[PDB]
Short mmCIF file of C-alpha atoms in Angstrom, two decimals:
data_model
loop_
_atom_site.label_atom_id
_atom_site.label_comp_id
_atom_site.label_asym_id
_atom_site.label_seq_id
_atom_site.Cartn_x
_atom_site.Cartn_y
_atom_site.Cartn_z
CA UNK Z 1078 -27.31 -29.81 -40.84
CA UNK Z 1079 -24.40 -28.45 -38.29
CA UNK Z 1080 -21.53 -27.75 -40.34
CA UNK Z 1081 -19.02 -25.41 -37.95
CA UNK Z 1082 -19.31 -25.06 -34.51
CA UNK Z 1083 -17.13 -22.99 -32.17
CA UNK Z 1084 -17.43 -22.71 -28.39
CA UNK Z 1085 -16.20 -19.67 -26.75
CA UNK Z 1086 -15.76 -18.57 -23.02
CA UNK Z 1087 -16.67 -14.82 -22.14
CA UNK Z 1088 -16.16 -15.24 -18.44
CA UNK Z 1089 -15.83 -17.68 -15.43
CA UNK Z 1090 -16.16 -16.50 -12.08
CA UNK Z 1091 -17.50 -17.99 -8.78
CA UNK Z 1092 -20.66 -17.09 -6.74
CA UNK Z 1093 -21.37 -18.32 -3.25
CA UNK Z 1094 -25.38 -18.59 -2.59
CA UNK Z 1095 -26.36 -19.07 1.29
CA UNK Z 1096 -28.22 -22.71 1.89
CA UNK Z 1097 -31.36 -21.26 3.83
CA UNK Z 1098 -31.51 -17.48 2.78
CA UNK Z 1099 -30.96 -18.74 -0.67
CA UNK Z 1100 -29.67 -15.25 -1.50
CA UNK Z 1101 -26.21 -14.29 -2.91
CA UNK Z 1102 -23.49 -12.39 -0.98
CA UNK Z 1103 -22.55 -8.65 -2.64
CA UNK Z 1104 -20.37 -7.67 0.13
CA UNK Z 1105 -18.49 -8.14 3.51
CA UNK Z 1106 -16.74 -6.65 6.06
CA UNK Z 1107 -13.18 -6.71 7.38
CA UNK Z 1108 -13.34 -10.05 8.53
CA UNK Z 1109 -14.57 -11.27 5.31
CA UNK Z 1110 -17.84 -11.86 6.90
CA UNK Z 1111 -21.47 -11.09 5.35
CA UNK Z 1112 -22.61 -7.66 5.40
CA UNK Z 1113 -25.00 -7.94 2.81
CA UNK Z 1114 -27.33 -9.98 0.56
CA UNK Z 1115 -29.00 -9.62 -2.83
CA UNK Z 1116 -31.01 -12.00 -4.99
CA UNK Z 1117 -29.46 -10.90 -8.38
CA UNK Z 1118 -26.31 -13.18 -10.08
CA UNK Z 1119 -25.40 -10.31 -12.04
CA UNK Z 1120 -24.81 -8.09 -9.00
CA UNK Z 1121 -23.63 -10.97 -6.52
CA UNK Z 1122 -20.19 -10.83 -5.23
CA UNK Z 1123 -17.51 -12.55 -7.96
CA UNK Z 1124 -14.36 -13.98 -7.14
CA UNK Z 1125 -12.13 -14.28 -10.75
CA UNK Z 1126 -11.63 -17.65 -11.80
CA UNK Z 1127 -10.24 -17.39 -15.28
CA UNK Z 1128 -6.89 -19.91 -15.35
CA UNK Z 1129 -4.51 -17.32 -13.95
CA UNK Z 1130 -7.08 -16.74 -10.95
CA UNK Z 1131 -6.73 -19.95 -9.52
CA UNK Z 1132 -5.78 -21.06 -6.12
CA UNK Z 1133 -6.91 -17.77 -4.74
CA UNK Z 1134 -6.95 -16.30 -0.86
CA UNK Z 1135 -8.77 -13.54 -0.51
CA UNK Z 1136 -11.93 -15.59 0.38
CA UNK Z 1137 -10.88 -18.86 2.37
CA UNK Z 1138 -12.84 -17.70 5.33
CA UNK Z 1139 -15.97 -17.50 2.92
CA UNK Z 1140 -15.24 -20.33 1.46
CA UNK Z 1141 -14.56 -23.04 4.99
CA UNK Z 1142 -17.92 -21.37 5.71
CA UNK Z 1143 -20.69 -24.34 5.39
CA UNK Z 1144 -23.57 -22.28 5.22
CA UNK Z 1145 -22.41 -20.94 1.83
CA UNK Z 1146 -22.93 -23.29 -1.12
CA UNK Z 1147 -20.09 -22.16 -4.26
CA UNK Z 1148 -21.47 -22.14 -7.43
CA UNK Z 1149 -19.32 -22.07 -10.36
CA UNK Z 1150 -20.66 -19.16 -13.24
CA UNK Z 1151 -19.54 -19.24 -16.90
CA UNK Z 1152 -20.95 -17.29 -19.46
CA UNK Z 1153 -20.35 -18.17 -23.07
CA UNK Z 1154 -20.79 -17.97 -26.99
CA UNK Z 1155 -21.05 -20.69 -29.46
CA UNK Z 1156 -21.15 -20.18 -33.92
CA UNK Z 1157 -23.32 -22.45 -35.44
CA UNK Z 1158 -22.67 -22.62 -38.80
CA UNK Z 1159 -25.44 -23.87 -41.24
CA UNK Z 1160 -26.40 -25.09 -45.13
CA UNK Z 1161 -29.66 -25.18 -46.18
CA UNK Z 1162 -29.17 -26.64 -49.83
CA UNK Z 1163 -31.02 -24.48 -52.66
CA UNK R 378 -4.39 33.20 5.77
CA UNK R 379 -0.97 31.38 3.80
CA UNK R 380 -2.11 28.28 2.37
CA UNK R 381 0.16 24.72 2.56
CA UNK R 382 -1.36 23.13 -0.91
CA UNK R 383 0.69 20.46 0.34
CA UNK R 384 -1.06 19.52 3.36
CA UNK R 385 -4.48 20.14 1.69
CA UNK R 386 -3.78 17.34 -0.94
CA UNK R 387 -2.87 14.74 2.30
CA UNK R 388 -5.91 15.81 4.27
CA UNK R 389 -8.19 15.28 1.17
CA UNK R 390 -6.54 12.33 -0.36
CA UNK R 391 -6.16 9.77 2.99
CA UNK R 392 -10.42 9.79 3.83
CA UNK R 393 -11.02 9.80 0.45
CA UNK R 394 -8.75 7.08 -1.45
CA UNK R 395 -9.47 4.97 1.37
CA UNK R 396 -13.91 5.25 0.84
CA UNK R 397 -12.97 4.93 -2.97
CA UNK R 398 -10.46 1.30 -2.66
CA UNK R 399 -13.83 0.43 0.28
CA UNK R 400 -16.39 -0.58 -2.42
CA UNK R 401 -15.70 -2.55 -5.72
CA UNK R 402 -18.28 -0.87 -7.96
CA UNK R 403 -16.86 2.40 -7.96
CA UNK R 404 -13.18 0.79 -8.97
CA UNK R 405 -15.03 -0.89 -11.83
CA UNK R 406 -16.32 2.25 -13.19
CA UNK R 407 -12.54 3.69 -12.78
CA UNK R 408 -11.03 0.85 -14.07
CA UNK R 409 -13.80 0.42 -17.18
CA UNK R 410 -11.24 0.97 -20.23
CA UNK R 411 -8.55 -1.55 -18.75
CA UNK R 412 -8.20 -4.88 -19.52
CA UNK R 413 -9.76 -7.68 -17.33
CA UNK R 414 -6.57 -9.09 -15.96
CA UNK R 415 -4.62 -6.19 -14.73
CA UNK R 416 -7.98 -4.93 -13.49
CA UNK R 417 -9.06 -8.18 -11.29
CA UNK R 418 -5.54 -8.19 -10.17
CA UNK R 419 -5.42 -4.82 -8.62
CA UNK R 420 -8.63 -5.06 -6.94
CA UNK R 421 -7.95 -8.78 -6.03
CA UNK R 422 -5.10 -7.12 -4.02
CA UNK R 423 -6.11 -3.55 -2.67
CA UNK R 424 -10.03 -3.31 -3.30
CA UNK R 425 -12.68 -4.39 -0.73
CA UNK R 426 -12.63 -3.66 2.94
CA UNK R 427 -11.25 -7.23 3.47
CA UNK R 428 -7.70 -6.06 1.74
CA UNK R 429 -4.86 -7.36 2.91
CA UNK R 430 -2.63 -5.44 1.29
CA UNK R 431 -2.93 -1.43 1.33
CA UNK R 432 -2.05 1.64 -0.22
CA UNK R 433 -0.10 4.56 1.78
CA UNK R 434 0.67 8.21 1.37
CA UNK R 435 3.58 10.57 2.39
CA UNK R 436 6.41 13.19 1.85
CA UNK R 437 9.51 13.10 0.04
CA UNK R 438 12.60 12.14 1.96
CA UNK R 439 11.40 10.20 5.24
CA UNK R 440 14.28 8.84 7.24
CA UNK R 441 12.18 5.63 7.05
CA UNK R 442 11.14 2.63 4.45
CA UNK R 443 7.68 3.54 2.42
CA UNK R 444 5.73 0.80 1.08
CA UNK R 445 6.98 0.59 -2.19
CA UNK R 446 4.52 -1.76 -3.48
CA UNK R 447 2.11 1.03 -4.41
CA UNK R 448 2.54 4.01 -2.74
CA UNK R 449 1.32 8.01 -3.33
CA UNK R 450 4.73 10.20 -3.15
CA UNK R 451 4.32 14.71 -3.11
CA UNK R 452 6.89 17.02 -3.61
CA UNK R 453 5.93 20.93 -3.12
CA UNK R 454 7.32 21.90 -6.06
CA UNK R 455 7.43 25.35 -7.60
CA UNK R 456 5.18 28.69 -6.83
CA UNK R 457 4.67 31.54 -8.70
CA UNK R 458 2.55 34.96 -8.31
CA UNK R 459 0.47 36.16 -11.26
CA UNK R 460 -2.25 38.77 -10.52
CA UNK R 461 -2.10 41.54 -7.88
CA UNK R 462 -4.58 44.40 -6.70
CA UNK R 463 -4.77 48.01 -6.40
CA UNK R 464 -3.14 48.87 -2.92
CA UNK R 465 -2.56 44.26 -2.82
CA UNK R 466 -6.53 44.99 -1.33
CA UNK R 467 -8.43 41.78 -1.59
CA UNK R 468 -11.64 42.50 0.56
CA UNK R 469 -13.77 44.14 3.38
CA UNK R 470 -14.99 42.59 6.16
CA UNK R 471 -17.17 43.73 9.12
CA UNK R 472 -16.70 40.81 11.04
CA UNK R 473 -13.32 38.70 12.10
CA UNK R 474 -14.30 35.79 9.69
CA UNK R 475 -12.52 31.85 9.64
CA UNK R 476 -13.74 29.10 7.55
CA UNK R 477 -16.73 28.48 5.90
CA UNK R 478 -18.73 25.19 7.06
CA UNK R 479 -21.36 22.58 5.94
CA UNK R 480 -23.22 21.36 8.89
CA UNK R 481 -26.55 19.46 8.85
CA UNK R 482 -29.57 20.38 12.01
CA UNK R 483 -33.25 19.74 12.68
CA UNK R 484 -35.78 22.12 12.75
CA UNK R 485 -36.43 22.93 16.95
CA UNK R 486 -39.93 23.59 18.08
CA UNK R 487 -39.77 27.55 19.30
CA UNK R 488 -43.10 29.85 19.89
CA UNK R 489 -42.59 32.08 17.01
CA UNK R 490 -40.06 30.51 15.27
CA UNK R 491 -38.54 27.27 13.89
CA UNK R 492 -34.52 27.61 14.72
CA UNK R 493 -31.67 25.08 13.39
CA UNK R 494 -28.69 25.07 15.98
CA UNK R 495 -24.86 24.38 14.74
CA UNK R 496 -22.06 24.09 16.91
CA UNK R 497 -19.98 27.30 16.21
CA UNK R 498 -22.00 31.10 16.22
CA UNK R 499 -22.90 31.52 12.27
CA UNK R 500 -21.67 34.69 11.51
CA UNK R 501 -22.19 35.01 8.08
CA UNK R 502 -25.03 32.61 6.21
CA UNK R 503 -24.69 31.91 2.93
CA UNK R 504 -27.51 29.17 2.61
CA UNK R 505 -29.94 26.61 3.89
CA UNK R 506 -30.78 23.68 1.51
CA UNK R 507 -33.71 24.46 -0.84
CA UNK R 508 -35.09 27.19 1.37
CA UNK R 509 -36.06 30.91 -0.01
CA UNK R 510 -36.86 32.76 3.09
CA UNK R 511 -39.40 35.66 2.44
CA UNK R 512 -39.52 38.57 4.04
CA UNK R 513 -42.77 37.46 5.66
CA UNK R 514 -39.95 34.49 7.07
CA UNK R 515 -38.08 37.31 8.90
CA UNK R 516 -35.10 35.03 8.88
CA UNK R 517 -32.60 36.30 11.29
CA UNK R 518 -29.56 34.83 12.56
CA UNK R 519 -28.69 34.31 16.62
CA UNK R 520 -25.63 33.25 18.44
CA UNK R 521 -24.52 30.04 17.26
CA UNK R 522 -28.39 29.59 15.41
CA UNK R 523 -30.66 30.71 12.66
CA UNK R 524 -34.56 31.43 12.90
CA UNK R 525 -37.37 31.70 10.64
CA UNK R 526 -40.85 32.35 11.70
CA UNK R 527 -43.38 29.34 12.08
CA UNK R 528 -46.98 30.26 10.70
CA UNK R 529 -47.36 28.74 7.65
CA UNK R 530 -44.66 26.93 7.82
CA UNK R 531 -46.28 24.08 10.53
CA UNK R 532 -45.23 21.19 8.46
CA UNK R 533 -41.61 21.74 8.98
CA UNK R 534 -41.13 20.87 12.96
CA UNK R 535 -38.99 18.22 11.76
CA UNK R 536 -37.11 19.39 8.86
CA UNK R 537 -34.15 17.64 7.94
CA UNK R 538 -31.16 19.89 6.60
CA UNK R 539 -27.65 21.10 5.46
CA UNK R 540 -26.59 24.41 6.63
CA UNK R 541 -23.46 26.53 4.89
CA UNK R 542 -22.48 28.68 7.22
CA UNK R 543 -18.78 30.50 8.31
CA UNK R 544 -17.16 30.80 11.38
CA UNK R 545 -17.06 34.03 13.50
CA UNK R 546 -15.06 34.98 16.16
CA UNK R 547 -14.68 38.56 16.60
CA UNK R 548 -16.65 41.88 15.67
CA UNK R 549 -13.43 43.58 15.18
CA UNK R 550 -13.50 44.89 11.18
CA UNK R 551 -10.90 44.55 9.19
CA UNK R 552 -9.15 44.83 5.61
CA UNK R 553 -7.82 42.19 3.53
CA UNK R 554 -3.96 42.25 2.30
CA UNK R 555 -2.78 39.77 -0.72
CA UNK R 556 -2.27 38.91 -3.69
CA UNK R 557 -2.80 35.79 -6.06
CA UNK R 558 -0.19 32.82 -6.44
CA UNK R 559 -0.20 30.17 -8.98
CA UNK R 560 1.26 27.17 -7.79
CA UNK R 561 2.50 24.06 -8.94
CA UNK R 562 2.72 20.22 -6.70
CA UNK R 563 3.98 16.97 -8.16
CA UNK R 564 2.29 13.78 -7.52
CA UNK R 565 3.57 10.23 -8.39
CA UNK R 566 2.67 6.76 -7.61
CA UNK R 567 5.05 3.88 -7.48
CA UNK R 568 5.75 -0.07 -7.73
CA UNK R 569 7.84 -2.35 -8.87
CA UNK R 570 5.17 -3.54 -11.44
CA UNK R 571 4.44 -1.14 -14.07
CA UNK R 572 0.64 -2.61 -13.89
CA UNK R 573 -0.01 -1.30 -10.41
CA UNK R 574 1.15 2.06 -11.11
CA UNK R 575 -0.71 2.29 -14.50
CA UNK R 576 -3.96 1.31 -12.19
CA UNK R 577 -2.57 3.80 -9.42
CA UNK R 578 -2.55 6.76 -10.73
CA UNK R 579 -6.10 6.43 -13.03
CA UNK R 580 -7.63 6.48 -9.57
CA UNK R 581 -5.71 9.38 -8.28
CA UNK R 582 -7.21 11.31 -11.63
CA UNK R 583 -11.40 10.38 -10.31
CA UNK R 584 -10.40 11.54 -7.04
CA UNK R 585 -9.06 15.41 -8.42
CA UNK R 586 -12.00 15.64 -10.23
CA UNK R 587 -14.38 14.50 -6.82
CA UNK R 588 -12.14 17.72 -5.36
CA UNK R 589 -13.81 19.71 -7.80
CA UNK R 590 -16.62 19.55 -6.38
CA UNK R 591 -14.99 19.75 -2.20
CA UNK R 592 -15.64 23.31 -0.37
CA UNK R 593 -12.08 24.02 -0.24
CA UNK R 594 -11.22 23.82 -4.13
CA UNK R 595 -14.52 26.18 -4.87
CA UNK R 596 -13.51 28.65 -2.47
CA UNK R 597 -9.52 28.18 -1.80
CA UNK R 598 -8.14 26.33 -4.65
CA UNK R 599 -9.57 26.88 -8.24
CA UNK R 600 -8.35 26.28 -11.91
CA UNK R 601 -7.05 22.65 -11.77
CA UNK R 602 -3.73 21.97 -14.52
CA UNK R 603 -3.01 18.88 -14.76
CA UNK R 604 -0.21 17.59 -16.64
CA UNK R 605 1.77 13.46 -16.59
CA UNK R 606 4.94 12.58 -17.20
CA UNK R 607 6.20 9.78 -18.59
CA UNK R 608 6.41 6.04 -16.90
CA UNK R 609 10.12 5.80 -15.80
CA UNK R 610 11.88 3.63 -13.74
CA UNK R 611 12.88 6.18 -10.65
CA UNK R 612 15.49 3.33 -8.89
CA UNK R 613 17.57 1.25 -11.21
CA UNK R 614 20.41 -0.16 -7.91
CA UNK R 615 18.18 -2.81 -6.47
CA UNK R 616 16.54 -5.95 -6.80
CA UNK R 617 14.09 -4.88 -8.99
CA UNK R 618 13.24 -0.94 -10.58
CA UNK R 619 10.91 1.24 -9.26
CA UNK R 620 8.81 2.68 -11.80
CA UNK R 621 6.30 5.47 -11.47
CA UNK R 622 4.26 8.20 -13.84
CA UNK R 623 4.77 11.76 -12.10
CA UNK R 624 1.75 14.18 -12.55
CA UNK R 625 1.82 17.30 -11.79
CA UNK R 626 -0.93 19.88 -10.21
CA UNK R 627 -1.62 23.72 -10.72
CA UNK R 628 -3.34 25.86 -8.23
CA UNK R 629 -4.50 29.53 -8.21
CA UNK R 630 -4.91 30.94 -4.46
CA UNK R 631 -4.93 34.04 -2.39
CA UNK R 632 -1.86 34.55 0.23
CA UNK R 633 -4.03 36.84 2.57
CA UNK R 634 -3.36 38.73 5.69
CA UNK R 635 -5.59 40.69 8.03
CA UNK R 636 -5.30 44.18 8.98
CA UNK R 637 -7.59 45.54 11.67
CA UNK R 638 -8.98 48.76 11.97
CA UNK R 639 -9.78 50.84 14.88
CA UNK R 640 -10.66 54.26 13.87
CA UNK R 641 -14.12 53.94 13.95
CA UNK R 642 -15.46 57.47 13.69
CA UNK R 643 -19.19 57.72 15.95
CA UNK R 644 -19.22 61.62 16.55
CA UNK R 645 -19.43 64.52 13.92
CA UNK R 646 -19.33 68.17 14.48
CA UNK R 647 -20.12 71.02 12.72
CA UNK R 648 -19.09 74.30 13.18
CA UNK R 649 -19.07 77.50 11.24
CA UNK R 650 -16.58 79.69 11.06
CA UNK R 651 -16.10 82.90 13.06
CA UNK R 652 -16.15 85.69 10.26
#
């Protein structure tokens, strides 16, 4: 028996993983190009995508890029609530 | 040896601010206690060697435009003396002496010795990384490189190291003139969103403590004050104001001067009297 249940978003950010390598970016260069890989999604390279983040331009060379595949990361929270009679 | 504080803060600040906006995990750290927007924000704009906007430094009134967006602003500001010495006498030297250097060598292959080689002659050593030289060592210093005997010591051909060494140029000895100064430099950031500046000038307080740690602050420039203003707006007939948090920086340093000597006595005579 469910009685409350809340949903609650901690974070939402984007993480590009590379089609062959399979690895995520962590860095790049001047050109926005990869300098660096790393096979971790907590230490992968983030680009902010709460709702005020949106439409962004720091990373539209990354992005056009085919051999990167986007992935869209959101961590959350949900209360569960619960009766268990006497 | 009269030291511009002024131009020590520029030299230290460009290389430095510029490594520190490089890499995002460092601003992280900086930026722990803010809040995730205005922290994203400012490292959505400046952080990361793929920034398209960036930060710049300078002196007050320049005939041109700064970058007013976020920008590091230094004013000399006032100097003061506070301790002096008996005859202003700060030290004795033996050697014409000029800065003191970090350089890193390799250990050459000699006969008898193993010798690191640095560009400029070493004059005075003060010390090799993690090395106690013994007396069966017989370190000894040479030109423009230091020796230390090789028997049981074989492993080392190729040892990898930092030397701390200063810079000679003459054997001419000489006395030290001076006295102490305590002096004071104001530092502010600025922007036209209160945000930026907020973000500015946290990073500006990591990077004085990194000096802490620099060559020149041990030897030249001890006893950090530091002391903020409040967030004001500096222009109010524009657009937009300019607001910025001034800070302000203490220093205690020696105003030296060198005075040579050149009655160096060799001979001595005795002679008794004729009665």
């Amino acid at each position: 028996s469910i009685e409350k249940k809340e949903e609650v978003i901690a974070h939402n950010e984007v993480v590009f993983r590379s089609l062959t390598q399979g690895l995520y970016v962590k860095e790049v260069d001047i050109y926005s190009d990869v300098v660096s890989y790393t096979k971790d999604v907590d230490e992968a390279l983030a680009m902010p995508n709460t709702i005020n983040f949106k439409n962004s331009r720091k990373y539209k060379k990354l992005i056009m890029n085919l051999d990167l595949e986007p992935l869209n990361k959101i961590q959350k929270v949900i209360y569960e609530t619960h009766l268990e009679g006497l | 040896a009269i030291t511009s504080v002024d131009s020590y803060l520029l030299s230290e600040i460009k290389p430095r601010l510029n490594t520190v906006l490089e890499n995002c995990y460092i601003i992280d750290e900086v930026l722990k206690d803010f809040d995730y927007q205005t922290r994203e924000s400012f490292k959505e704009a400046f952080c990361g060697k793929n920034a398209q906007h960036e930060v710049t430094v300078g002196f007050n009134f320049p005939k041109f435009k700064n970058n007013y967006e976020a920008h590091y602003l230094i004013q000399l500001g006032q100097g003061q003396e506070t301790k002096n010495s008996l005859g202003s006498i700060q030290s004795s030297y033996f050697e014409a002496t000029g800065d003191t250097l970090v350089e890193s060598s390799t250990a050459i292959r000699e006969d008898d010795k193993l010798v690191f080689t640095v560009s400029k002659p070493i004059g005075e050593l003060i010390k090799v990384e993690d090395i106690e030289f013994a007396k069966y060592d017989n370190l000894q210093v040479e030109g423009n490189k230091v020796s230390f005997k090789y028997q049981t010591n074989e492993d080392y051909e190729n040892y990898n190291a930092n030397i701390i060494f200063t810079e000679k140029k003459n054997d001419s000895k000489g006395l030290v003139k001076g006295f102490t100064v305590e002096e004071q430099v104001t530092v502010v950031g600025l922007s036209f969103n209160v945000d930026v500046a907020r973000c500015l000038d946290a990073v500006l307080k990591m990077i004085l403590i990194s000096m802490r740690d620099s060559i020149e602050e041990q030897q030249t420039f001890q006893l950090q004050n530091l002391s903020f203003g409040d967030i004001a707006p500096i222009i109010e007939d524009g657009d937009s104001m300019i607001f910025g948090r001034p800070t302000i920086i203490k220093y205690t340093s020696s105003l030296d001067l060198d005075y040579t000597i050149t009655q160096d006595i060799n001979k001595l005579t005795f002679k008794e009297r004729k009665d």
